[PDB]
Design a protein around this ligand. Sequence first.
Ligand SMILES: [Fe+3]
Ligand SMILES: [Fe+3]
Lengths: 321, 322
Amino acid sequence: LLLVETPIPQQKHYESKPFPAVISPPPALSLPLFTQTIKTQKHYLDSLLHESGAVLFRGFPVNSADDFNDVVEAFGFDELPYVGGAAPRTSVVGRVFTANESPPDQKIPFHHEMAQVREFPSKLFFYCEIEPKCGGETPIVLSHVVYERMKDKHPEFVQRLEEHGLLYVRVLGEDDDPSSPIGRGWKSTFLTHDKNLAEQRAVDLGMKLEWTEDGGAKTVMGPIPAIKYDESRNRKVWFNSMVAAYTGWEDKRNDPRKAVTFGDGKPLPADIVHDCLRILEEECVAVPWQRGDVLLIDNWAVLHSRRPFDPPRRVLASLCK
Amino acid sequence: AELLLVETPIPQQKHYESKPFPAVISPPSASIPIPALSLPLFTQTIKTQKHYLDSLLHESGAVLFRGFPVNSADDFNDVVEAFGFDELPYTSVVGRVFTANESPPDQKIPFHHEMAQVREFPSKLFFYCEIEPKCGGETPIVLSHVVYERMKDKHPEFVQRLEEHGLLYVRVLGEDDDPSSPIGRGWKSTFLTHDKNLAEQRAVDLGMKLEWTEDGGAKTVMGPIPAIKYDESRNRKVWFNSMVAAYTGWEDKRNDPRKAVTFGDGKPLPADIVHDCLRILEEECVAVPWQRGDVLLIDNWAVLHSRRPFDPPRRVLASLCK
Ligand SMILES: [Fe+3]
Ligand SMILES: [Fe+3]
């Protein structure tokens, strides 16, 4: 067959590079012909991903979870083994999983997948098996651009983060609440029912777990950096969950404003965090999904969100080491 | 090119009234001509042998298909799509195929009838082994009408009080969801709502009284409902309920199984008799070891199923019929 770099409305451009790059089709199209071209075009697709940081594959016959898994499987990358510290995921087939994100009428803030985890995914794929009835887009934005704008806007603020970093406080109940923006419990996060076994995996994950009265838990993480360095492209990125925590970690157990602070305890300037929230919006590209689309996101360069939505909707994913 | 569906015997099968349980079909050894067993030939033979497969499934309660090119979830969906049963109106792997949210391997799943307390339960069910368990993992099955007949013969009075009073099912669920619980789902993720009024309205649509505990939780009561139904296709009574199941497997921090199921009038069931029912179920069951490629078809009106503990890997898919 073949692969074709195609233009779309939403995409943006940076130094003559489309974001995201879009690949579409030009023996009639088949699912085994596609996975076959994926292997045949490995170099081309590694570079395109390197140049753009994400590529949406639209038009190909990926019509099921198993189908998406063949495409994920065809890509070669090794799966990232789960260790705990993320919403309750449900295995579907092979390297592909699902997870009932926060309530459908909410906004999922921008973040890097498992950003506060030691072994975070280098890459990830998103796949739509069920088109959203309304809304429910997976807006994406280039982390390095957000860095070039933050350093430009608030140069002193970045400097404090580069020296002080951030601290995160995330109170977790014993069970999971499907109502909160971040409703995972401690037994679910750490895949443990026992406390010792838990507080142990807690230290291994680099967290300060301290059991709460009502069987809950209050974890503390950091100081940790906010500006990491993607070596493959020699550039720093906004690899932190500042906006996610400050505006998103909001429920009966956590205060948004207290969710995250400077690495040395000093509170963050509200007008600065929300200014960052505004930078993410402006630079983000939210391509409306379609049944069959496959988006390849490099986790070193991209943060992902989720617009609110009205069901039905089914987006599947795959995490790479 | 044609294919022979050959009835075959296996060590684990039983026989009642001369009929095998479960009936087992496989493709012959030396056929004339010799067919190149394929998945597309199998599904065509299933469509062509509809009547024969209706009689076998009709008289045996379940039919295990052994020795067929069912090599992936895609192949399994093609089989289910050849039998012609309507799909049960609504995770999803492909088409009508899906993975069943289960408990840890070391645990044993109690015997039951699929969706036994849901107005529109599956009439028929399919199980498929894509990956045979390293150890155990079998999907034991048992004939519901046999359990009924033996219980009535051993405990006539108790059976008489079962049909007359029925059963009461109690569940004390939290607001949130405990991951480590066989019945961990709380009222939120149960009735898809945060609002207490709507939630209780929905539980009521499901024929159930919903109580609001002061601890932010909820207590639900179902019944009285029969513990014994009548298979019309086979003109016989079936032990269609979840008594033994709930009495032994409905436990966690908020729930005690001993009081999870009682007589429809609130009177507790005799522990000795429930365990005695557990005994009959275990004796009459058939636990055929799973071989990759197998697809088991169960008539949900005549058969209760459960699971054995196992050591992974193990992968089984399923499909439900209206
Ligand atoms: Fe995410
Ligand atoms: Fe079951």
